[PDB]
Design a protein around this ligand. Structure first.
Ligand code: ZN
Ligand code: ZN
Ligand code: ZN
Length: 178
């Protein structure tokens, strides 16, 4: 197994996957690494299993259909993995914890949002459809773009949104387009 966390790339108290060489800090894995369970399979392994059991699940989908899916176990897992893929980028630090807004010439967003809030919401089963999760994720980056206006720091929102969107299209097998 790897000697660093797959998400944050640091050593520490790591839990190792039994079916792949990845390792995780307890709260870096999503869901948080389960208490017992031997063997344990990580979220990467569990997602690969879904695909292997239903190969047709990788045929292209329309985003509109995906967003209306109810959050049954497999869609819950997919959103958890998509959230984890965002935290895997170091630039996610900017969006993890609760923001505050005091900048000359800007007003804060009406509805603040951050990754740890989405994480809690998933853990508490607060989203009934994929659309709920996706709307909160996209709102993180939209709030950031609107607040920072012409400051070059706006680009951090664009960058982390691109990670989100690429992974959304991969995980939910969105039909490729030009
Ligand atoms: Zn970690
Ligand atoms: Zn694994
Ligand atoms: Zn099948």
């Amino acid at each position: 197994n790897s000697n660093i966390c797959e998400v944050c790339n640091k050593w520490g108290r790591l839990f190792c996957c039994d079916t792949c060489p990845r390792s995780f800090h307890e709260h870096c894995h999503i869901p948080s690494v389960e208490a017992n369970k031997n063997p344990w399979s990580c979220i990467f392994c569990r997602i690969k299993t879904i695909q292997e059991r239903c190969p047709e699940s990788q045929s292209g989908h329309q985003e509109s259909e995906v967003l209306m899916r109810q959050m049954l176990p497999e869609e819950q897992l997919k959103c958890e993995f998509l959230l984890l893929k965002v935290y895997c980028d170091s630039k996610s630090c900017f969006f993890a914890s609760e923001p505050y807004y005091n900048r000359e010439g800007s007003q804060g967003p009406q509805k603040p949002m951050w990754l740890n809030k989405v994480k809690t919401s998933l853990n508490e089963q607060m989203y009934t459809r994929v659309e709920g999760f996706v709307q909160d994720m996209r709102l993180i980056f939209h709030n950031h773009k609107e607040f920072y206006r012409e400051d070059k720091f706006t680009r951090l929102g664009i960058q982390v949104q691109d990670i989100f969107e690429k992974n959304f299209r991969n995980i939910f097998a969105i039909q490729e387009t030009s």
